[PDB]
Amino acid sequence: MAMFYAHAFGGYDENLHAFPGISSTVANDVRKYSVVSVYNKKYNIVKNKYMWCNSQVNKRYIGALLPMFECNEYLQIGDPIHDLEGNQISIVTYRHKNYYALSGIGYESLDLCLEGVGIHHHVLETGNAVYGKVQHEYSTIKEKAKEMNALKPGPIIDYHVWIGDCVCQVTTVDVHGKEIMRMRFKRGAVLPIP
Amino acid sequence: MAMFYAHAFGGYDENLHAFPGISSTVANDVRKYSVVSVYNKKYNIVKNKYMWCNSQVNKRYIGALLPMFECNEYLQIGDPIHDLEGNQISIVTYRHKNYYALSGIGYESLDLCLEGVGIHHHVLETGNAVYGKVQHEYSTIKEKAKEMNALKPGPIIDYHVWIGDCVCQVTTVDVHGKEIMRMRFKRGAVLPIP
C-alpha cells in the first residue's frame, strides 16, 4: 500500500512526496479529516488552530501549517495514523503537549533552499508586533522600524517564522536585521515542543 | 472621521495605515463584511474567492488578498464604500470585470521592499504547475524542475505571484531562473484587470 517514511529516521527520499517530517508514496490532502485513529483509538482534529511544522533535509526546508489532533496518550514518531475507514494516511511526526500534527498536504506552506541563509522559529506573543528578527510591544517595534528605515537593504541572510494564536508571519532580514520582505498567513497556530 | 486616500491619486502617506491602493487614518478589518453599499446600492461580498491587489509606492510593495463584492455598475477609484449601518469602511480601488476589491485588513498579505528586485503577477491556469518564473503543464514543469535542480542557488532577484482559483503562490528566482523559495496560500482568487 502507501508508504510513509520519517525524516527523523533518515527516511527522506527526494523522489517521493515531501511534507514536514515525512516522505511518502502518496500525497494526501489532510485538511478534510476531522477524526483520525492511532492504534484503534479515535482522536478529534482541532478546529481553527494548527501546527507549524518543518523538516530540514539536504539543504531544503519543508515547512507548513498542519492540522493537529488532541491525544492524551504519548505517541512516538512513526506511529501510523489512520482514517476511520482503516486506511493509513500519515505517521506521527510532531507534538505540542497534547496536540499531534497530521502531516501531508495542509494549509499555508514555505519551501526554501537553505543554501546561504538561516531560518528561525518564534512563538509570537499575543498583542506583540514584529519587525525583522524581533517581536515587542507595538510602540517599541514602531521605533525599531524607524531606526532601521534609513538603512540601505543588504542581501537576505535569514528567515524568521512567527507563529501566533491569530496570525502567522514570515519575515526576511539582512545582516543588520532590516526587514526585506514580510508575509502574513491569517491562521492561528502553535509550534512543536521537542 | 475616518479618512481614506487613493494611492492612484498621489494619496500615499507613509505615516498612515497602508493597504493596497489606500492610505487611511484607520485600520479596518474587512474580512467580517458580507454586504456593503456604494451610493445607496447594496452589493454582496463573494464567498471563498478573493482579489489579489497591490500598490507600489516609493520602493514599497503593498499586496494582499482582499474581499471583493459583485457590482454590475461601473464604480470609480475613490468612490466611498460603506457598511449597511452608514459608516464608511473603504474606497473603491481595483476591479476585475464585475468584481470590486474591498481594501483594508484582508487575508494573506505580502509586504516587500522592491530595492534591487522585480515582482510580477500571473493568472495561474487551472491544472498547471509552476517552476520559478514560468507556468506550464505538470509534465513540462517537472522536466524543467529537473534540468534546474543541479544549479547552485544564488540571491533572489525577482518575485512571482501566481493567482489561481483554488490556490495562490509566491515564488522567487535568482539570476539563472532557479526557484529559491515558494509560499502557498490555500485560497482562490482573481487579479485586477486594468
mmCIF file of C-alpha atoms in Angstrom:
data_model
loop_
_atom_site.group_PDB
_atom_site.id
_atom_site.type_symbol
_atom_site.label_atom_id
_atom_site.label_comp_id
_atom_site.label_asym_id
_atom_site.label_seq_id
_atom_site.Cartn_x
_atom_site.Cartn_y
_atom_site.Cartn_z
ATOM 1 C CA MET A 1 0.000 0.000 0.000
ATOM 2 C CA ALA A 2 1.098 3.571 0.683
ATOM 3 C CA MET A 3 4.489 4.042 2.354
ATOM 4 C CA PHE A 4 5.364 6.728 4.910
ATOM 5 C CA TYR A 5 8.981 7.327 5.956
ATOM 6 C CA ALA A 6 10.121 9.509 8.857
ATOM 7 C CA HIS A 7 12.746 12.175 8.141
ATOM 8 C CA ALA A 8 13.920 11.892 11.754
ATOM 9 C CA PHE A 9 14.965 8.291 10.995
ATOM 10 C CA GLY A 10 16.692 9.002 7.675
ATOM 11 C CA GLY A 11 13.583 8.413 5.578
ATOM 12 C CA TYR A 12 13.894 11.444 3.298
ATOM 13 C CA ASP A 13 13.745 10.418 -0.366
ATOM 14 C CA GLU A 14 13.843 13.285 -2.855
ATOM 15 C CA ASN A 15 11.902 11.225 -5.429
ATOM 16 C CA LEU A 16 8.900 10.848 -3.090
ATOM 17 C CA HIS A 17 6.340 13.399 -1.956
ATOM 18 C CA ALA A 18 7.757 15.530 0.855
ATOM 19 C CA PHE A 19 5.818 17.070 3.744
ATOM 20 C CA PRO A 20 7.037 18.174 7.212
ATOM 21 C CA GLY A 21 8.664 15.095 8.722
ATOM 22 C CA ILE A 22 7.525 12.627 6.021
ATOM 23 C CA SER A 23 8.437 11.261 2.620
ATOM 24 C CA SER A 24 5.528 9.290 1.181
ATOM 25 C CA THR A 25 4.476 7.412 -1.950
ATOM 26 C CA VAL A 26 1.142 9.292 -1.800
ATOM 27 C CA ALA A 27 0.178 12.953 -1.420
ATOM 28 C CA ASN A 28 -2.832 13.026 0.907
ATOM 29 C CA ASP A 29 -4.798 16.223 1.483
ATOM 30 C CA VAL A 30 -5.180 16.077 5.276
ATOM 31 C CA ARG A 31 -7.344 19.217 5.540
ATOM 32 C CA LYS A 32 -10.593 17.253 5.206
ATOM 33 C CA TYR A 33 -10.254 14.922 8.201
ATOM 34 C CA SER A 34 -11.955 15.756 11.491
ATOM 35 C CA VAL A 35 -11.267 12.437 13.280
ATOM 36 C CA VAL A 36 -8.243 10.136 12.987
ATOM 37 C CA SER A 37 -7.208 6.886 14.662
ATOM 38 C CA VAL A 38 -3.897 5.774 16.181
ATOM 39 C CA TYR A 39 -3.747 2.121 17.306
ATOM 40 C CA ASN A 40 -7.550 1.814 17.062
ATOM 41 C CA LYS A 41 -8.126 4.867 19.287
ATOM 42 C CA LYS A 42 -10.052 7.822 17.862
ATOM 43 C CA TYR A 43 -8.952 11.445 18.222
ATOM 44 C CA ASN A 44 -10.547 14.725 17.130
ATOM 45 C CA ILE A 45 -8.824 17.211 14.841
ATOM 46 C CA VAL A 46 -8.640 20.677 16.395
ATOM 47 C CA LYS A 47 -10.731 23.305 14.607
ATOM 48 C CA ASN A 48 -9.308 26.691 13.547
ATOM 49 C CA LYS A 49 -5.876 26.100 15.114
ATOM 50 C CA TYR A 50 -2.886 24.391 13.517
ATOM 51 C CA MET A 51 0.774 23.447 13.997
ATOM 52 C CA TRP A 52 3.642 24.976 12.044
ATOM 53 C CA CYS A 53 5.966 22.036 11.368
ATOM 54 C CA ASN A 54 9.159 21.735 9.359
ATOM 55 C CA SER A 55 11.829 19.247 8.431
ATOM 56 C CA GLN A 56 15.236 20.279 7.106
ATOM 57 C CA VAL A 57 16.812 17.607 4.900
ATOM 58 C CA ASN A 58 19.724 18.000 2.479
ATOM 59 C CA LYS A 59 19.767 21.821 2.085
ATOM 60 C CA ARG A 60 15.969 22.000 1.772
ATOM 61 C CA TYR A 61 13.394 23.461 4.174
ATOM 62 C CA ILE A 62 9.898 21.920 4.134
ATOM 63 C CA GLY A 63 7.509 23.887 6.337
ATOM 64 C CA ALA A 64 3.742 24.102 6.537
ATOM 65 C CA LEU A 65 0.728 24.708 8.741
ATOM 66 C CA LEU A 66 -0.698 21.271 9.509
ATOM 67 C CA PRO A 67 -3.891 20.040 11.164
ATOM 68 C CA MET A 68 -3.429 18.593 14.629
ATOM 69 C CA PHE A 69 -5.411 16.172 16.768
ATOM 70 C CA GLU A 70 -5.765 16.104 20.546
ATOM 71 C CA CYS A 71 -4.443 12.989 22.276
ATOM 72 C CA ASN A 72 -3.640 12.489 25.953
ATOM 73 C CA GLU A 73 -1.631 9.320 25.281
ATOM 74 C CA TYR A 74 2.047 9.680 24.440
ATOM 75 C CA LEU A 75 2.641 8.867 20.766
ATOM 76 C CA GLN A 76 6.018 8.369 19.101
ATOM 77 C CA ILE A 77 7.452 9.322 15.713
ATOM 78 C CA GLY A 78 6.404 6.795 13.091
ATOM 79 C CA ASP A 79 3.208 5.627 14.785
ATOM 80 C CA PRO A 80 0.724 5.039 11.935
ATOM 81 C CA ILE A 81 -2.231 7.422 11.695
ATOM 82 C CA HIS A 82 -5.381 6.083 10.042
ATOM 83 C CA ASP A 83 -8.703 7.392 8.824
ATOM 84 C CA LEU A 84 -11.952 5.932 10.149
ATOM 85 C CA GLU A 85 -12.051 3.518 7.182
ATOM 86 C CA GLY A 86 -8.832 1.670 8.053
ATOM 87 C CA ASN A 87 -6.517 3.421 5.582
ATOM 88 C CA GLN A 88 -3.159 4.748 6.757
ATOM 89 C CA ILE A 89 -2.991 8.442 5.871
ATOM 90 C CA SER A 90 0.109 9.675 7.753
ATOM 91 C CA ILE A 91 2.545 8.930 10.590
ATOM 92 C CA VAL A 92 3.144 10.696 13.895
ATOM 93 C CA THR A 93 5.771 13.409 13.463
ATOM 94 C CA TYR A 94 5.487 16.465 15.729
ATOM 95 C CA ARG A 95 3.842 17.220 19.059
ATOM 96 C CA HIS A 96 2.949 20.227 21.209
ATOM 97 C CA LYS A 97 1.872 18.947 24.633
ATOM 98 C CA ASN A 98 -1.318 17.018 23.797
ATOM 99 C CA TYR A 99 -1.506 18.240 20.170
ATOM 100 C CA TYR A 100 -0.136 16.000 17.402
ATOM 101 C CA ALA A 101 0.448 17.169 13.837
ATOM 102 C CA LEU A 102 -1.241 15.386 10.923
ATOM 103 C CA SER A 103 1.345 15.742 8.168
ATOM 104 C CA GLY A 104 0.501 15.827 4.467
ATOM 105 C CA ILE A 105 -0.908 18.478 2.167
ATOM 106 C CA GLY A 106 -2.081 21.067 4.670
ATOM 107 C CA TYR A 107 -2.580 24.822 4.763
ATOM 108 C CA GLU A 108 -0.056 27.603 4.112
ATOM 109 C CA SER A 109 3.450 26.391 3.296
ATOM 110 C CA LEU A 110 7.033 27.593 2.941
ATOM 111 C CA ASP A 111 9.599 25.747 0.816
ATOM 112 C CA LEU A 112 13.106 27.167 0.752
ATOM 113 C CA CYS A 113 16.640 26.446 -0.426
ATOM 114 C CA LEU A 114 18.626 26.851 2.799
ATOM 115 C CA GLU A 115 21.873 27.466 0.886
ATOM 116 C CA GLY A 116 23.440 30.642 2.257
ATOM 117 C CA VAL A 117 20.608 31.598 4.634
ATOM 118 C CA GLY A 118 19.338 30.628 8.058
ATOM 119 C CA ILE A 119 15.796 30.194 9.339
ATOM 120 C CA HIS A 120 14.409 30.648 12.848
ATOM 121 C CA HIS A 121 11.061 29.975 14.512
ATOM 122 C CA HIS A 122 9.415 32.117 17.199
ATOM 123 C CA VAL A 123 6.284 31.998 19.329
ATOM 124 C CA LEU A 124 4.566 35.333 18.706
ATOM 125 C CA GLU A 125 3.187 36.824 21.921
ATOM 126 C CA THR A 126 -0.435 37.939 21.722
ATOM 127 C CA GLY A 127 -0.544 41.704 21.285
ATOM 128 C CA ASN A 128 3.091 41.967 20.180
ATOM 129 C CA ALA A 129 4.267 43.404 16.874
ATOM 130 C CA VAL A 130 7.057 42.153 14.618
ATOM 131 C CA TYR A 131 9.859 43.919 12.806
ATOM 132 C CA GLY A 132 12.502 41.876 11.037
ATOM 133 C CA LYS A 133 14.046 39.483 13.552
ATOM 134 C CA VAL A 134 12.348 40.730 16.750
ATOM 135 C CA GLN A 135 8.960 40.995 18.422
ATOM 136 C CA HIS A 136 7.982 43.560 21.062
ATOM 137 C CA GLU A 137 5.217 45.952 22.060
ATOM 138 C CA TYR A 138 3.725 47.932 19.183
ATOM 139 C CA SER A 139 5.223 51.311 20.105
ATOM 140 C CA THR A 140 8.651 49.748 20.670
ATOM 141 C CA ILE A 141 8.526 47.963 17.300
ATOM 142 C CA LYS A 142 7.437 51.220 15.647
ATOM 143 C CA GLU A 143 10.639 52.832 16.932
ATOM 144 C CA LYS A 144 12.866 49.914 15.931
ATOM 145 C CA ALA A 145 11.371 50.104 12.438
ATOM 146 C CA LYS A 146 12.096 53.843 12.428
ATOM 147 C CA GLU A 147 15.733 53.334 13.445
ATOM 148 C CA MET A 148 16.073 50.778 10.628
ATOM 149 C CA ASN A 149 14.094 52.591 7.915
ATOM 150 C CA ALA A 150 17.055 54.744 6.857
ATOM 151 C CA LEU A 151 19.467 51.884 6.143
ATOM 152 C CA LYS A 152 20.125 50.513 2.681
ATOM 153 C CA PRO A 153 18.887 46.899 2.476
ATOM 154 C CA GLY A 154 21.602 44.288 2.219
ATOM 155 C CA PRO A 155 21.023 40.755 0.950
ATOM 156 C CA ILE A 156 18.639 38.370 2.672
ATOM 157 C CA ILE A 157 20.507 36.164 5.120
ATOM 158 C CA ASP A 158 17.794 34.904 7.482
ATOM 159 C CA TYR A 159 14.158 33.850 7.509
ATOM 160 C CA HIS A 160 12.070 34.294 10.659
ATOM 161 C CA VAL A 161 8.786 32.441 11.168
ATOM 162 C CA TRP A 162 6.378 33.996 13.686
ATOM 163 C CA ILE A 163 3.660 31.651 14.961
ATOM 164 C CA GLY A 164 0.808 33.363 16.805
ATOM 165 C CA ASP A 165 -2.643 32.447 18.075
ATOM 166 C CA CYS A 166 -4.375 34.626 15.448
ATOM 167 C CA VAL A 167 -1.793 35.193 12.688
ATOM 168 C CA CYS A 168 1.423 33.653 11.384
ATOM 169 C CA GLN A 169 4.108 35.668 9.607
ATOM 170 C CA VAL A 170 7.348 35.109 7.697
ATOM 171 C CA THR A 171 9.985 37.845 7.533
ATOM 172 C CA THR A 172 13.391 38.067 5.870
ATOM 173 C CA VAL A 173 16.261 40.222 7.145
ATOM 174 C CA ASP A 174 19.715 41.366 6.108
ATOM 175 C CA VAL A 175 22.840 41.426 8.287
ATOM 176 C CA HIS A 176 21.566 44.375 10.322
ATOM 177 C CA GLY A 177 18.130 42.921 10.969
ATOM 178 C CA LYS A 178 16.436 45.217 8.459
ATOM 179 C CA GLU A 179 13.194 43.721 7.170
ATOM 180 C CA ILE A 180 13.291 42.940 3.445
ATOM 181 C CA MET A 181 10.018 41.089 2.975
ATOM 182 C CA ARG A 182 7.131 40.189 5.246
ATOM 183 C CA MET A 183 4.426 37.712 4.594
ATOM 184 C CA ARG A 184 1.321 37.102 6.750
ATOM 185 C CA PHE A 185 -0.867 33.982 6.898
ATOM 186 C CA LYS A 186 -4.250 34.621 8.527
ATOM 187 C CA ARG A 187 -4.439 31.467 10.655
ATOM 188 C CA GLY A 188 -3.668 30.708 14.305
ATOM 189 C CA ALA A 189 -1.193 28.022 15.283
ATOM 190 C CA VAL A 190 1.347 26.612 17.736
ATOM 191 C CA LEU A 191 4.929 25.392 17.323
ATOM 192 C CA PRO A 192 6.127 21.874 18.203
ATOM 193 C CA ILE A 193 7.864 21.373 21.537
ATOM 194 C CA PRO A 194 10.876 18.991 21.149
ATOM 195 C CA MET B 1 -13.968 60.948 10.892
ATOM 196 C CA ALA B 2 -12.003 58.186 9.177
ATOM 197 C CA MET B 3 -10.050 59.341 6.116
ATOM 198 C CA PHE B 4 -9.180 57.234 3.059
ATOM 199 C CA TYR B 5 -6.742 58.370 0.358
ATOM 200 C CA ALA B 6 -6.234 56.677 -3.013
ATOM 201 C CA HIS B 7 -2.653 55.788 -3.956
ATOM 202 C CA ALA B 8 -3.597 56.194 -7.630
ATOM 203 C CA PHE B 9 -4.232 59.903 -6.935
ATOM 204 C CA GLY B 10 -0.984 60.603 -5.073
ATOM 205 C CA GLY B 11 -2.554 59.817 -1.706
ATOM 206 C CA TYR B 12 0.154 57.594 -0.213
ATOM 207 C CA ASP B 13 1.225 58.740 3.263
ATOM 208 C CA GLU B 14 3.854 56.607 4.993
ATOM 209 C CA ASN B 15 2.620 57.731 8.428
ATOM 210 C CA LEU B 16 -0.888 56.362 7.742
ATOM 211 C CA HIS B 17 -2.085 52.766 7.582
ATOM 212 C CA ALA B 18 -1.183 51.169 4.255
ATOM 213 C CA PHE B 19 -3.324 48.712 2.296
ATOM 214 C CA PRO B 20 -3.482 48.015 -1.454
ATOM 215 C CA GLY B 21 -4.464 51.293 -3.103
ATOM 216 C CA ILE B 22 -5.252 53.063 0.201
ATOM 217 C CA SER B 23 -3.616 55.135 2.912
ATOM 218 C CA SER B 24 -6.042 55.610 5.790
ATOM 219 C CA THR B 25 -6.308 57.066 9.284
ATOM 220 C CA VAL B 26 -7.940 53.790 10.409
ATOM 221 C CA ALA B 27 -7.164 50.086 10.018
ATOM 222 C CA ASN B 28 -10.453 48.309 9.305
ATOM 223 C CA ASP B 29 -10.625 44.513 9.263
ATOM 224 C CA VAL B 30 -12.761 43.977 6.163
ATOM 225 C CA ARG B 31 -12.996 40.180 6.467
ATOM 226 C CA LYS B 32 -16.147 40.435 8.602
ATOM 227 C CA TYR B 33 -18.393 42.031 5.949
ATOM 228 C CA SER B 34 -20.843 40.024 3.858
ATOM 229 C CA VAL B 35 -22.573 43.074 2.322
ATOM 230 C CA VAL B 36 -21.513 46.646 1.537
ATOM 231 C CA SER B 37 -23.080 49.697 -0.064
ATOM 232 C CA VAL B 38 -21.909 52.280 -2.583
ATOM 233 C CA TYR B 39 -24.148 55.309 -3.243
ATOM 234 C CA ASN B 40 -27.313 53.779 -1.738
ATOM 235 C CA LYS B 41 -26.932 50.465 -3.591
ATOM 236 C CA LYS B 42 -26.196 47.188 -1.803
ATOM 237 C CA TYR B 43 -23.686 44.586 -3.012
ATOM 238 C CA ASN B 44 -22.817 41.083 -1.793
ATOM 239 C CA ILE B 45 -19.282 40.023 -0.888
ATOM 240 C CA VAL B 46 -18.203 36.936 -2.829
ATOM 241 C CA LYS B 47 -17.718 33.869 -0.642
ATOM 242 C CA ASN B 48 -14.479 31.861 -0.736
ATOM 243 C CA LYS B 49 -12.916 33.802 -3.626
ATOM 244 C CA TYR B 50 -10.825 36.951 -3.351
ATOM 245 C CA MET B 51 -8.800 39.538 -5.283
ATOM 246 C CA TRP B 52 -5.020 39.843 -5.097
ATOM 247 C CA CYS B 53 -4.404 43.599 -5.189
ATOM 248 C CA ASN B 54 -1.221 45.612 -4.834
ATOM 249 C CA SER B 55 0.023 49.165 -4.886
ATOM 250 C CA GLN B 56 3.679 50.073 -5.381
ATOM 251 C CA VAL B 57 4.618 53.418 -3.829
ATOM 252 C CA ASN B 58 8.189 54.693 -3.448
ATOM 253 C CA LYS B 59 10.073 51.351 -3.453
ATOM 254 C CA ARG B 60 7.390 49.706 -1.293
ATOM 255 C CA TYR B 61 5.159 46.839 -2.457
ATOM 256 C CA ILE B 62 1.835 46.502 -0.598
ATOM 257 C CA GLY B 63 -0.043 43.368 -1.698
ATOM 258 C CA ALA B 64 -2.846 41.338 -0.155
ATOM 259 C CA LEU B 65 -5.773 39.011 -0.800
ATOM 260 C CA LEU B 66 -8.833 41.230 -0.369
ATOM 261 C CA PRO B 67 -12.561 40.518 -0.169
ATOM 262 C CA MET B 68 -14.494 41.521 -3.230
ATOM 263 C CA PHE B 69 -18.108 42.396 -3.982
ATOM 264 C CA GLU B 70 -20.143 41.843 -7.140
ATOM 265 C CA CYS B 71 -21.414 45.036 -8.762
ATOM 266 C CA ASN B 72 -22.692 45.499 -12.306
ATOM 267 C CA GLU B 73 -22.420 49.294 -12.098
ATOM 268 C CA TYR B 74 -19.162 50.922 -13.128
ATOM 269 C CA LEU B 75 -17.588 52.351 -9.969
ATOM 270 C CA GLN B 76 -14.637 54.734 -9.967
ATOM 271 C CA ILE B 77 -11.484 54.880 -7.851
ATOM 272 C CA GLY B 78 -12.242 56.774 -4.652
ATOM 273 C CA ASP B 79 -15.978 56.060 -4.516
ATOM 274 C CA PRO B 80 -16.821 55.616 -0.809
ATOM 275 C CA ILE B 81 -17.733 52.110 0.359
ATOM 276 C CA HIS B 82 -19.990 51.877 3.416
ATOM 277 C CA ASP B 83 -21.291 49.113 5.603
ATOM 278 C CA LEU B 84 -25.056 48.769 5.951
ATOM 279 C CA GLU B 85 -25.068 50.967 9.079
ATOM 280 C CA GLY B 86 -23.809 54.155 7.402
ATOM 281 C CA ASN B 87 -20.108 54.018 8.332
ATOM 282 C CA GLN B 88 -17.552 54.421 5.560
ATOM 283 C CA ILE B 89 -15.180 51.456 5.661
ATOM 284 C CA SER B 90 -13.064 51.816 2.481
ATOM 285 C CA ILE B 91 -12.927 53.348 -1.002
ATOM 286 C CA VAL B 92 -13.126 51.740 -4.429
ATOM 287 C CA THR B 93 -9.660 50.715 -5.618
ATOM 288 C CA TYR B 94 -9.390 47.748 -8.001
ATOM 289 C CA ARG B 95 -11.791 45.941 -10.337
ATOM 290 C CA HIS B 96 -11.984 42.608 -12.177
ATOM 291 C CA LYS B 97 -14.949 42.892 -14.571
ATOM 292 C CA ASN B 98 -17.913 42.921 -12.146
ATOM 293 C CA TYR B 99 -15.801 42.232 -9.024
ATOM 294 C CA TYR B 100 -14.593 45.123 -6.854
ATOM 295 C CA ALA B 101 -11.974 44.811 -4.124
ATOM 296 C CA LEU B 102 -12.708 45.847 -0.528
ATOM 297 C CA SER B 103 -9.343 47.162 0.644
ATOM 298 C CA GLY B 104 -8.309 47.071 4.298
ATOM 299 C CA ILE B 105 -7.007 44.338 6.557
ATOM 300 C CA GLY B 106 -7.794 41.265 4.485
ATOM 301 C CA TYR B 107 -6.351 37.777 4.142
ATOM 302 C CA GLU B 108 -2.812 36.740 3.185
ATOM 303 C CA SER B 109 -0.563 39.753 2.595
ATOM 304 C CA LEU B 110 2.883 40.378 1.114
ATOM 305 C CA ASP B 111 4.903 43.481 2.005
ATOM 306 C CA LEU B 112 8.195 43.861 0.180
ATOM 307 C CA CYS B 113 10.986 46.357 -0.341
ATOM 308 C CA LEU B 114 11.494 46.467 -4.117
ATOM 309 C CA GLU B 115 15.122 47.606 -3.829
ATOM 310 C CA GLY B 116 17.096 45.632 -6.399
ATOM 311 C CA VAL B 117 14.272 43.197 -7.239
ATOM 312 C CA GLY B 118 11.267 42.894 -9.502
ATOM 313 C CA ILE B 119 7.787 41.492 -8.870
ATOM 314 C CA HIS B 120 5.400 40.052 -11.452
ATOM 315 C CA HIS B 121 1.820 38.811 -11.277
ATOM 316 C CA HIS B 122 0.308 35.917 -13.223
ATOM 317 C CA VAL B 123 -3.035 34.207 -13.641
ATOM 318 C CA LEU B 124 -2.380 30.550 -12.813
ATOM 319 C CA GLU B 125 -4.200 28.312 -15.284
ATOM 320 C CA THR B 126 -6.231 25.606 -13.537
ATOM 321 C CA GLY B 127 -4.279 22.355 -13.510
ATOM 322 C CA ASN B 128 -0.951 23.980 -14.388
ATOM 323 C CA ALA B 129 2.227 23.690 -12.347
ATOM 324 C CA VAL B 130 4.825 26.346 -11.564
ATOM 325 C CA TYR B 131 8.596 26.371 -11.507
ATOM 326 C CA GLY B 132 10.232 29.678 -10.702
ATOM 327 C CA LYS B 133 9.224 32.265 -13.295
ATOM 328 C CA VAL B 134 7.092 30.061 -15.583
ATOM 329 C CA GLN B 135 3.888 28.032 -15.574
ATOM 330 C CA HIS B 136 3.010 25.148 -17.907
ATOM 331 C CA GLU B 137 1.550 21.643 -17.844
ATOM 332 C CA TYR B 138 2.652 19.439 -14.948
ATOM 333 C CA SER B 139 4.722 17.267 -17.293
ATOM 334 C CA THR B 140 6.613 20.163 -18.893
ATOM 335 C CA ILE B 141 7.214 21.760 -15.485
ATOM 336 C CA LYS B 142 8.511 18.528 -13.931
ATOM 337 C CA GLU B 143 11.089 18.343 -16.729
ATOM 338 C CA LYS B 144 12.048 21.965 -16.053
ATOM 339 C CA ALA B 145 12.478 21.403 -12.309
ATOM 340 C CA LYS B 146 14.820 18.509 -13.097
ATOM 341 C CA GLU B 147 17.023 20.443 -15.532
ATOM 342 C CA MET B 148 17.239 23.257 -12.968
ATOM 343 C CA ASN B 149 17.902 21.054 -9.924
ATOM 344 C CA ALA B 150 21.678 20.932 -10.441
ATOM 345 C CA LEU B 151 22.158 24.711 -10.287
ATOM 346 C CA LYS B 152 23.567 26.230 -7.121
ATOM 347 C CA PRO B 153 21.082 28.787 -5.752
ATOM 348 C CA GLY B 154 22.008 32.443 -5.951
ATOM 349 C CA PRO B 155 20.421 35.505 -4.357
ATOM 350 C CA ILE B 156 16.812 36.358 -5.158
ATOM 351 C CA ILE B 157 16.289 38.931 -7.903
ATOM 352 C CA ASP B 158 12.588 38.521 -8.788
ATOM 353 C CA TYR B 159 9.297 37.617 -7.115
ATOM 354 C CA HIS B 160 6.403 35.953 -8.938
ATOM 355 C CA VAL B 161 2.803 35.921 -7.696
ATOM 356 C CA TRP B 162 0.597 33.126 -9.068
ATOM 357 C CA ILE B 163 -3.138 33.730 -8.594
ATOM 358 C CA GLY B 164 -5.276 30.633 -9.144
ATOM 359 C CA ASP B 165 -8.907 29.810 -8.466
ATOM 360 C CA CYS B 166 -8.086 27.235 -5.773
ATOM 361 C CA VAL B 167 -4.555 28.202 -4.687
ATOM 362 C CA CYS B 168 -2.252 31.220 -4.757
ATOM 363 C CA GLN B 169 1.544 31.017 -4.675
ATOM 364 C CA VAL B 170 4.594 33.271 -4.471
ATOM 365 C CA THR B 171 7.871 32.060 -5.967
ATOM 366 C CA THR B 172 11.312 33.664 -6.168
ATOM 367 C CA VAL B 173 14.164 33.193 -8.642
ATOM 368 C CA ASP B 174 17.854 34.018 -8.888
ATOM 369 C CA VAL B 175 19.650 35.306 -11.989
ATOM 370 C CA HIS B 176 19.603 31.844 -13.619
ATOM 371 C CA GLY B 177 15.883 31.300 -13.017
ATOM 372 C CA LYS B 178 16.375 28.760 -10.237
ATOM 373 C CA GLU B 179 13.493 28.716 -7.765
ATOM 374 C CA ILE B 180 14.811 29.748 -4.346
ATOM 375 C CA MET B 181 11.684 29.945 -2.196
ATOM 376 C CA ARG B 182 7.961 29.303 -2.544
ATOM 377 C CA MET B 183 4.972 30.154 -0.344
ATOM 378 C CA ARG B 184 1.448 28.766 -0.939
ATOM 379 C CA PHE B 185 -1.946 30.024 0.288
ATOM 380 C CA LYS B 186 -4.952 27.746 0.312
ATOM 381 C CA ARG B 187 -7.337 30.347 -1.109
ATOM 382 C CA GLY B 188 -8.683 31.024 -4.600
ATOM 383 C CA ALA B 189 -8.618 34.456 -6.202
ATOM 384 C CA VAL B 190 -8.532 36.645 -9.307
ATOM 385 C CA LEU B 191 -6.283 39.528 -10.346
ATOM 386 C CA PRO B 192 -7.491 43.063 -11.131
ATOM 387 C CA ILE B 193 -7.972 43.944 -14.786
ATOM 388 C CA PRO B 194 -6.617 47.467 -15.616
#
